[PDB]
Design a protein around this ligand. Structure first.
Ligand SMILES: *[C@@](C)(CO)[C@](*)(O)[C@H](Cc1ccccc1)NC(=O)[C@H](Cc1ccc(OC)cc1)NC(=O)[C@H](C)NC(=O)CN1CCOCC1
Ligand SMILES: *[C@@](C)(CO)[C@](*)(O)[C@H](Cc1ccccc1)NC(=O)[C@H](Cc1ccc(OC)cc1)NC(=O)[C@H](C)NC(=O)CN1CCOCC1
Ligand SMILES: *[C@@](C)(CO)[C@](*)(O)[C@H](Cc1ccccc1)NC(=O)[C@H](Cc1ccc(OC)cc1)NC(=O)[C@H](C)NC(=O)CN1CCOCC1
Ligand SMILES: *[C@@](C)(CO)[C@](*)(O)[C@H](Cc1ccccc1)NC(=O)[C@H](Cc1ccc(OC)cc1)NC(=O)[C@H](C)NC(=O)CN1CCOCC1
Ligand SMILES: [Mg+2]
Ligand SMILES: [Mg+2]
Ligand SMILES: [Mg+2]
Lengths: 195, 222, 225, 212, 204, 196, 222, 196, 195
């Protein structure tokens, strides 16, 4: 775990997530996908404590998929984010809390708008134009403050994202083995293979 | 806090200051520390502010139900027993230090309860951070066979000692007199010896001083 | 770094129109054990100053020796040792205050609260406090330990500010002090009934009273409880 | 703190914020974090205010004594090493300092040295130091080229502090700019973030996260 | 790791002549890192306004909880809850979590629709009601707000004057606290109109 | 506290001081540490005021319920109920209790229950912080089958010494006399006992 | 374990005008919840038109003032009775404070006087010697209450010109000694209301080219 | 330890038990806790055996050097040297020492020096762990100007009680009689004192 | 600091040393030379506590240079390594020890042999065919055990070293920004610029 980013542009949400899975002094894997598709137009990236992250992500995934089958209907990104926040808000006062931070990128088909939510392990939710978890934020937020515009295209958003990854690869102490980028828009979720 | 209780001829009087603190900051300059458990049983509370309020209300609620059940006016020893058994159960974690007083068919009574659930009996008592300033005055001036007006004077003087000399106490003096055969009279702000002096200047700003970005009407209706 | 072993409790004092009064019980406590009953915690320096000390008694006895030595040293090559160049209360205080702060700064404090009561050569009342931290302050009424919590409130009812001092007589002041000592006996668990009291007046001089007792105590109401 | 200094075609830019903090209490908004050692040397301050302030003005006295004794202005390398050797003697004692000794000399040219309280001393072209260093880096690195004009470099330095001043809770107040050339340092003014933010937001079109 | 000062934020409420004002900052951070400059801390249930400072997850949770409770209140009572009653509800709900509390500093503000009296109240994290004639303060810059309010405030201010006072109270307090600021919102509340204003303040 | 109970010819006498302390502050200087659990079964309380009170109240409740079903309980029975509470809750209690009662068959009896919750039947018992100072004195001066006046003097002189040395003890000396005649309360003030 | 520090409470405040400077401080001295003295001054005339106050731990405060006063004395002896300028005093104090960097004076120090151009000057220090000249500074227990009020009223922060759309700031101007003393008195009454360690009395020392004048005002004694 | 010193008509008597403990083990059951620092100035030692021994040896050295220059030292002087060592090294010492000596001018004198290093001149003194149990007894039974036989009985009965209750005390009761006549050592065995 | 390697081959000693200087969550420099030339045919790399490393390296450098000037003679690599070990052996029982680990690569001109010494901060000296300090050893030692031969050329040694750096870049958690390689042989010390 470690690096998860998110950028909401005009017509889409772009989630970048590091590929490295490190443990002790060994990078065990360099092609890890730190994301789950909750619904056709909703994607959740995650970072935090080992085990907890995937266990939580798949638990949320199951619940949202169960809802989809029951109602024959896709929950809005806002509704999913509120459900996730509540699960974490319960968790924090449990015997053993989930130590997982998440970003939820979704395209609301009713509003025809991209939406990016940032939720930490305490259950602290915020809607943002761009978001990051962990130490990444300390570099990317100020970078995006400068270069981000609300009316950018998906291509412009990817170039803006390349600028973040470059800055992190320059100044971050740890090797995070690049990122897997995914785009969420009106046509659903797709992965950029060459980044 | 500073709180006191004093017995007299035909009843009992309690009193309290009106300061509430959060560390060195005065949160409330005129809070009410005198609490009604039943019409003629009143409680003065020091310690954790929410605990004194909550524990006094809970027992006050159960006392009312008990009074209705038994078709009798509640007794101070019932409130004393219920409060102490509740506080003891929580091993001091409910930080309520109370002076319980009142009149009932048995007579007039004065007790104190500590957070851990121990109870005292006395003719004069004081609790709170300014209890030593108060108790000094009570030990100096108290006597057997006090009249009503003497007891109020003694009680308010003991509270004043705390107001002036204790940093945890200040502002005003609340008093409650419970006399046998009469209605209990709650004297909210019986003394107000700490009125704020006139400010040197009006800080009313010229309209338009604050820079505004947006305005909008908020819909409160359905 | 210390911990106090044998200790003395409250020292109380106040100014009145012509001078100052100071008092302190004759107890040397050993924790909860009320070990020693013949301990004098008021120590006169000359005929114009009394130093009242609470806290560790071994450190008090050390301070006694310092003051005793200060009188000796002041007399050396000093033809006016009993006149113009006699030890003033202010000199005695400042010396102790210096020592107390130097010891706290060396992390090895004299574990005491000290009140220096006296009358200056020009007739002015001197009353000032110093403790193990080197903290100093002055007030119309001063007290240490439990005295600060119980005596001061009572003494301040007599002299609440500077302008009340000329209006207070030695009879009124001593009465308040003796009352305060009684209250402390009721409420302080490390106090004794026996105490000493000292009056330093600008006219009558130093009057040192020993073997005083707390009396006129109210205990009768206990039978009803 | 956020302080930076970077080397480029036209010399050195140095930029700092002006906030001082005691926990979450904002102790000051008008602090001078650049100390002018001589007409060709600058020192930046980050970390403990007393530590920085005391030892860097002490450094200035040592540099003055060098040019009295050696009849020649001290090198940026030698000046930085006086400070680094000093703090190394106090290593473990608890000094907190993040400094940058920026200046020009004939033999060295424009030079920047990072010196900190655990005894690290590094020559380099770009450094950002302080609680908000990461925020400054984000903007500075993504816009930095060697061939920046004096006008563009001054702005980038100003904009990088502004970026950090905004995001970092323990940075802010105002921006102090300096430009070091072969002829010495030149002060380019105090810029209050209160006005500078809105001026930059409007003109640049940036800071779209904020409610306009 | 002090729950009440991780996210940061402040709320202040004042009374005027036949009106009340409640104001808050917009910052949400994670200690030093500022994360959101749109995080509002004032909510309303009918005509009763509630500001909440402290741990942001609890701020959100309590808002959702009081919306829940006031909605059921209205359905059963067939009327909007009043400030005095809501204050009691808040106190009950907080003390219910006595030994596992919400790390919050709520502030009730509003005008009683029956009596027309302005009402403000504050609470500690554990439910203790702090009623006041003049003003209530809360958050990481409460000390600052106490000092600003105590000096600037005067009784019976008109809505337009009260706006200036409460705004200046919040703004100057926020600028002395690292974890507060990043924007501000002020609600001016009259008997049957409410005006919401976003303040221009320094963004550091 | 300084407390003690002493058996004698006609029955048993309980004795106690009246000081309650919170640190070196005396919260109550007229405390009643002698408490009735039954008509002629009393106890002296030392340790935590809250704990001893809660225990005494529970015991009083048990013995009242015992009396309603099986008539007057023995002093031994009363001590067993105290023990049961003190022993089973030893981790959460700071209570040193002396139980004393008068039967007509068994006459005066004294049981002491220290911190652990063990029971010890004795001719006389001493307890509380101030008791340490009078072990020497009480052992030398106690005799079996004393008269009422002798036992009152024994307790008065003993607690006088305990009070003199222990800072945690003081105030008045309360006593409770348990005989066939009935129950008698005695009080003795500082001005009398101090100058013994 | 022995703790060599303590907190004697109180608060201080310095404001600079065009041709004058004030240094104010309350006269209350406290430990924990007890008042030691209602009148114990902590703002001192140190000579050469420099007034000084070191608020926090009084023993360290008195020690520092004592050392600086002595530093002024030796500055005269060693440099032909030259007047110690306020800027030079400030630098000297930094070395006094930093001298004990690893066992600090637990005090917020403020000095006030006139600079070498005759204009009002206030310097303020942290406990280990960092200093800065300002128009305005509050120090001590109630510094967090008073300081933001000063920012608003002395430096006109967050105050814009009415009708200018929040574009033109309220212009900075020097305050008259009458206006400054109004702000000082309102600052201290407000601080006394909401801070328990502040009260009893207010003593202001005003510095002009003519010398050092004093003014005293009663504060609330609760 | 249980130790005590008592002044009387003809001079002063020192008394002590003989038990030395390392935990609950008795390392030495025949210890001599009464030690000579000068011909007719002795001391009772309580606390750390190593500390009190080292102090006593230094004092004995100082008083021997005093005697070589200024003749016989007073009992007060001896106590001052003890105090000086105990006070100045209070952080590194666990020593409770009673000093007792006979002058011809001042007769019998007793000085007690507790942990802190303070000095207290008394008619009689008690110290050590077992002293707590006899404060009551000793106060009630001590009289000024007792005879030799009365003082011996007072000490014997006192230390008997101290020994009986204190586990850290026991063995024999040693005594040392200081008068104008000279120095007399007394010993009393369990079989005598236990059944007092 | 962090990665320092050493390989002794037939005719030379090759020292590789990481270029990254990290502090907190910021890589402050990516071109740092963690080495000092003690004498014309003796090179010392170093890694450890910040400040200590350079302070120690330059102190040793000054002493060896002082010896060279005094005797007009170069100390043998063995002699220098023994001097360095003794300085660290003193240091470890000082009030504040140098927390510095070093590798000393040298060419003994009298023996015509390359020599590699590994010395830790405790003063533990060992002569080795290949050496590493810190976590690097956990990967490189087993790698070199397999691929190292005693009769390799300098070119073969560099290829062997490339194999180590590749393995570290793959499995090490932190980004150490590559290495500066230096060769010590009969002709002295020279730096490989393209690695
Ligand atoms: C005097 C003023 C305190 O010295 C009184 O005891 C006063 C009692 C009182 C009673 C009813 C209404 C108002 C006031 N006590 C307080 O005001 C109390 C002081 C206190 C603070 C913290 C404590 O635990 C560490 C104990 C006593 N202050 C409060 O209750 C304030 C309003 N609340 C808090 O500080 C919140 N605390 C409560 C305990 O849990 C941790 C947070
Ligand atoms: C930003 C604001 C983050 O703090 C900068 O690092 C800033 C740099 C700076 C430089 C020169 C003048 C002013 C400001 N640092 C501070 O403002 C500094 C932060 C800090 C506090 C304590 C530290 O402990 C080692 C380290 C850094 N603030 C202070 O130094 C404040 C004014 N003073 C104190 O906290 C007094 N402390 C200092 C340490 O010793 C105990 C007393
Ligand atoms: C003497 C004074 C000392 O042992 C007695 O044992 C006395 C017995 C007594 C008092 C009143 C009524 C009947 C009997 N005990 C006390 O006065 C007691 C001292 C004590 C407190 C706590 C203890 O262990 C937990 C042991 C002894 N005083 C109190 O209980 C007072 C009223 N309350 C406090 O001191 C507050 N305590 C609560 C428990 O935790 C420590 C703080
Ligand atoms: C009675 C037994 C208990 O206080 C006496 O005070 C007695 C005095 C005595 C003994 C021998 C000769 C003359 C006088 N003291 C001891 O027997 C003493 C007990 C004691 C040990 C250490 C203390 O504090 C450091 C206090 C009291 N016993 C010893 O010194 C024995 C010989 N040694 C040990 O117990 C080993 N100690 C060494 C010090 O640290 C703890 C372990
Ligand atoms: Mg007060
Ligand atoms: Mg900021
Ligand atoms: Mg034995």
């Amino acid at each position: 775990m470690d690096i998860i980013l998110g950028i909401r542009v005009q017509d889409s949400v772009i989630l970048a997530s590091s590929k490295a899975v490190t443990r002790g002094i060994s990078v065990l894997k360099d092609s890890d996908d730190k994301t789950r598709q909750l619904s056709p137009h909703t994607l959740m990236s995650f970072a935090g404590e080992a085990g907890d992250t995937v266990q939580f992500a798949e638990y949320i995934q199951a619940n949202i998929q169960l809802y989809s089958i029951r109602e024959d209907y896709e929950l809005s990104p806002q509704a999913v984010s509120s459900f996730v926040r509540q699960e974490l808000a319960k968790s924090i006062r449990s015997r053993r809390p989930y130590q997982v931070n998440v970003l939820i990128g979704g395209y609301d088909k009713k509003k025809n708008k991209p939406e990016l939510y940032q939720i930490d392990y305490l259950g602290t939710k915020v809607e943002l134009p761009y978001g990051a978890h962990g130490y990444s934020g300390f570099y990317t937020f100020s970078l995006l403050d400068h270069h981000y515009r609300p009316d950018m295209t998906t291509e412009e958003g990817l170039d803006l994202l390349k600028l973040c990854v470059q800055e992190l690869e320059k100044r971050m102490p740890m090797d995070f083995k690049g990122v897997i980028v995914k785009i969420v828009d009106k046509d659903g979720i797709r992965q950029v293979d060459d980044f | 806090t500073t709180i006191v209780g004093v017995k007299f001829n035909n009843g009992v009087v309690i009193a309290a200051d009106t300061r509430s603190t959060q560390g060195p900051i005065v949160a409330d300059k005129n809070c009410a520390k005198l609490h009604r458990i039943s019409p003629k049983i009143w409680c003065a509370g020091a310690g954790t502010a929410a605990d004194t309020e909550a524990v006094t209300q809970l027992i006050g609620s159960n006392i009312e139900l008990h009074s209705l059940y038994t078709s009798r006016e509640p007794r101070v020893v019932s409130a004393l027993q219920m409060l102490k058994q509740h506080l003891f159960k929580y091993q001091g974690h409910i930080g309520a230090y109370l002076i319980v007083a009142g009149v009932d068919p048995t007579g007039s009574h004065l007790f104190s309860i500590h957070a851990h659930g121990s109870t005292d009996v006395g003719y004069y008592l004081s609790l709170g951070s300014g209890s030593l300033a108060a108790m000094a005055v009570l030990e100096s001036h108290w006597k057997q066979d006090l009249t009503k007006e003497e007891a109020i004077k003694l009680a308010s003087d003991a509270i004043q000692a705390g107001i002036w000399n204790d940093l945890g106490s200040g502002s005003n003096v609340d008093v409650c007199v419970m006399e046998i055969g009469k209605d209990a009279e709650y004297l909210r702000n019986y003394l107000t010896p700490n009125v704020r002096e006139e400010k040197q200047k009006s800080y009313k700003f010229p309209r338009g001083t604050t820079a505004v970005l947006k305005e909008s009407i908020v819909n409160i209706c359905d | 770094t210390q911990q106090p072993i044998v200790t003395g409790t409250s020292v109380i004092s106040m100014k009145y129109d012509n001078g100052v009064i100071i008092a302190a019980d004759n107890l040397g406590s050993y924790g909860s054990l009320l070990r020693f009953n013949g301990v004098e915690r008021l120590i006169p320096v000359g005929d114009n100053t009394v130093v009242g000390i609470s806290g560790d008694i071994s450190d008090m006895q050390h301070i006694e020796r310092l003051l005793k030595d200060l009188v000796t040293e002041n007399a050396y090559d000093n033809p006016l040792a009993d006149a113009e160049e006699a030890l003033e209360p202010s000199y005695i205080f400042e010396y102790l205050a210096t020592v107390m702060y130097q010891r706290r700064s060396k992390m090895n404090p004299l574990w005491n609260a000290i009140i220096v009561a006296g009358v200056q050569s020009n007739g002015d009342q001197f009353l000032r406090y110093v403790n193990l931290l080197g903290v100093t302050y002055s007030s119309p009424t001063l007290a240490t330990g439990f005295g600060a919590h119980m005596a001061n409130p009572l003494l301040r009812k007599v002299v609440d500010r500077e302008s009340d001092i000329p209006k207070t007589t030695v009879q009124v002041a001593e009465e308040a002090i003796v009352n305060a000592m009684r209250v402390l006996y009721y409420r302080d668990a490390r106090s004794s009934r026996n105490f000493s009291l000292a009056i330093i007046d600008k006219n009558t001089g130093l009057t040192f009273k020993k073997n005083l007792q707390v009396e006129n105590m109210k205990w009768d109401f206990a039978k009803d409880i | 703190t956020t302080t930076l200094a970077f080397r480029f075609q036209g010399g050195i830019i140095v930029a700092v914020d002006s906030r001082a903090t005691a926990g979450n209490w904002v102790a000051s908004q008008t602090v001078k974090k650049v100390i002018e050692i001589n007409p060709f040397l600058l020192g930046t301050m980050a970390g403990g205010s007393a530590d920085c302030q005391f030892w860097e003005t002490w450094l200035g006295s040592q540099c003055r004594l060098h040019e009295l004794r050696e009849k020649e202005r001290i090198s940026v390398a030698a000046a930085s090493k006086i400070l680094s050797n000093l703090v190394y003697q106090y290593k473990g004692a608890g000094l907190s300092m993040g400094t940058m000794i920026c200046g020009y000399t004939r033999k060295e040219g424009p030079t920047i040295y990072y010196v900190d309280s655990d005894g690290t001393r590094l020559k380099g072209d770009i450094f950002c130091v302080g609680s908000g260093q990461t925020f400054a880096y984000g903007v500075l690195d993504s816009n930095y080229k060697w061939d920046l004009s004096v006008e563009d470099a001054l702005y980038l330095g100003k904009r990088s502090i502004l970026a950090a001043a905004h995001r970092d809770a323990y940075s802010g107040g105002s921006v102090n700019l300096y430009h070091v050339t072969e002829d010495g340092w030149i002060y380019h003014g105090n810029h209050d973030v209160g006005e500078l933010f809105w001026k930059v937001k409007e003109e640049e079109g940036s800071f779209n996260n904020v409610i306009g | 790791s002090d729950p009440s000062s991780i996210n940061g934020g402040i709320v202040v409420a004042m009374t005027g002549k036949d009106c009340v004002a409640i104001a808050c900052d917009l910052r949400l951070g994670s200690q030093s890192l500022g994360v959101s400059n749109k995080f509002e801390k004032i909510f309303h249930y009918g005509h009763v306004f509630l500001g909440i400072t402290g741990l942001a997850t609890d701020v959100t949770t309590l808002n959702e909880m009081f919306r829940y409770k006031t909605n059921l209140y209205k359905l059963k009572e067939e009327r909007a809850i009043e400030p005095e009653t809501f204050t009691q509800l808040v106190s009950s709900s907080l003390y219910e979590r006595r030994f596992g509390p919400y790390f919050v500093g709520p502030v009730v503000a509003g005008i009683n629709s029956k009596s027309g009296k302005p009402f403000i109240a504050g609470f500690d994290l554990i439910g203790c009601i702090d009623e006041a004639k003049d003003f209530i303060v809360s958050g990481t810059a409460s000390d600052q707000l106490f000092g600003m309010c105590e000096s600037l405030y005067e009784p019976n201010l008109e809505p337009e004057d009260l706006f200036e006072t409460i705004s200046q109270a919040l703004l100057n307090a926020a600028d002395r606290d690292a974890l507060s600021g990043w924007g501000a919102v002020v609600y001016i509340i009259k008997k049957d109109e409410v005006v919401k204003r976003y303040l221009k303040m320094r963004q550091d | 506290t300084s407390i003690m109970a002493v058996t004698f010819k006609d029955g048993v006498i309980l004795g106690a001081d009246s000081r309650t302390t919170t640190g070196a502050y005396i919260a109550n200087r007229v405390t009643d540490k002698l408490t009735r659990v039954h008509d002629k079964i009393w106890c002296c309380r030392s340790g935590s005021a809250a704990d001893t009170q809660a225990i005494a109240d529970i015991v009083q409740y048990h013995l009242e319920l015992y009396t309603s079903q099986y008539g007057t309980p023995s002093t031994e029975t009363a001590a067993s109920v105290f023990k049961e509470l003190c022993y089973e809750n030893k981790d959460n209690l700071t209570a040193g209790i002396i139980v004393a009662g008068y039967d007509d068959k068994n006459k005066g009896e004294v049981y002491t229950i220290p911190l652990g919750g063990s029971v010890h039947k004795l001719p006389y018992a001493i307890a509380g912080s101030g008791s340490t100072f009078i072990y020497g004195y009480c052992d030398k001066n106690f005799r079996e089958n004393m008269s009422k006046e002798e036992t009152v003097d024994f307790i008065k002189h003993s607690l006088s010494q305990a009070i003199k040395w222990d800072g945690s003890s003081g105030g008045v000396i309360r006593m409770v006399v348990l005989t066939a005649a009935g129950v008698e309360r005695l009080i003795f003030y500082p001005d009398e006992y101090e100058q013994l | 374990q022995f703790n060599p520090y303590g907190d004697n409470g109180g608060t201080i405040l310095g404001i600079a005008g065009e041709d004058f400077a004030v240094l104010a401080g309350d006269t209350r001295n406290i430990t924990d919840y007890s008042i030691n003295s209602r009148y114990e001054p902590k703002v001192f005339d140190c000579g050469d038109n420099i007034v000084m106050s070191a608020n926090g731990f009084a023993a360290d405060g008195d020690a520092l003032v004592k050392r600086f006063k002595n530093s002024v004395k030796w500055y005269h002896f060693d440099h032909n009775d030259k007047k110690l300028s306020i800027n030079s005093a400030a630098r000297n104090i930094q070395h006094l404070l930093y001298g004990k960097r690893f066992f600090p004076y637990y005090v917020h120090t403020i000095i006030a006087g006139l600079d070498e151009d005759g204009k009002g000057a206030v310097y303020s220090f942290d406990p280990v010697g960092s200093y800065e000249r300002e128009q305005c500074r509050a120090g001590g227990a109630a510094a967090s209450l008073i300081m933001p009020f000063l920012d608003n009223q002395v430096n006109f922060k967050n105050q814009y010109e009415p009708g200018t759309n929040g574009k033109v700031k309220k212009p900075l101007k020097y305050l008259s000694v009458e206006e400054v003393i109004k702000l000082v008195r309102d600052s201290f009454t407000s601080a006394t209301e909401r801070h328990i360690q502040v009260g009893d009395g207010l003593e202001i020392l005003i510095v002009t080219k003519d010398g050092v004048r004093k003014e005293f005002y009663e504060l609330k004694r609760d």
